[PDB]
């Protein structure tokens, strides 16, 4: 139903037929970013829960795939699996823990 990600459709009658008006979503304005599969922090491999890791040149963020809305990489949007000796292309960065200012 249309080209792009389908949202809605509307029917209209026609002589000997039907006409579908397909409302779809199309991505528009692209931008290049530096990406990594996982992040090695304290000898632990962090993978994004839903999204990808992007970099604008200096800092690293986590973003949903279909729209650019960067977020600070925390422990509430990443998960830990193994060490950082297996994944090819892993980068070194920090992962913020929200409980640390709560304890301090």
């Amino acid at each position: 139903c249309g080209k792009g990600y389908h949202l809605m459709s509307f029917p209209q009658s026609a002589p000997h037929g039907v006409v579908f008006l397909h409302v779809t979503y199309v991505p528009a304005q692209e931008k290049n970013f530096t990406t990594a599969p996982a992040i090695c922090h304290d000898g632990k491999a962090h993978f994004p829960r839903e999204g990808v890791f992007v970099s604008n040149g200096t800092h690293w963020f986590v973003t949903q795939r279909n729209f650019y809305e960067p977020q600070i990489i925390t422990t509430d949007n990443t998960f830990v699996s193994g060490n950082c000796d297996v994944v090819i292309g892993i980068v070194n960065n920090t992962v913020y823990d929200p409980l640390q200012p709560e304890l301090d």
């Binding site: 199309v26 991505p27 304005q29 729209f67």
Partner: protein, 49 residues
């Protein structure tokens, strides 16, 4: 005839492209459903009274 414009995707193993905006597009699809129902009398066609 031309199959289309030539494009080259800038592939790399540490580079990604992420959209920053969007477009809401409405397109049209036309489908036939039914045709004309006809009826033929053989005696009127072949012979005609």
């Amino acid at each position: 005839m031309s199959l289309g414009a030539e494009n080259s995707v800038a592939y790399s193993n540490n580079s990604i492209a992420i959209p920053t905006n969007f477009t809401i597009s409405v397109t049209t699809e036309i489908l036939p459903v039914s045709m004309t129902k006809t009826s033929v009398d053989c005696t009127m066609y072949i012979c005609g009274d």
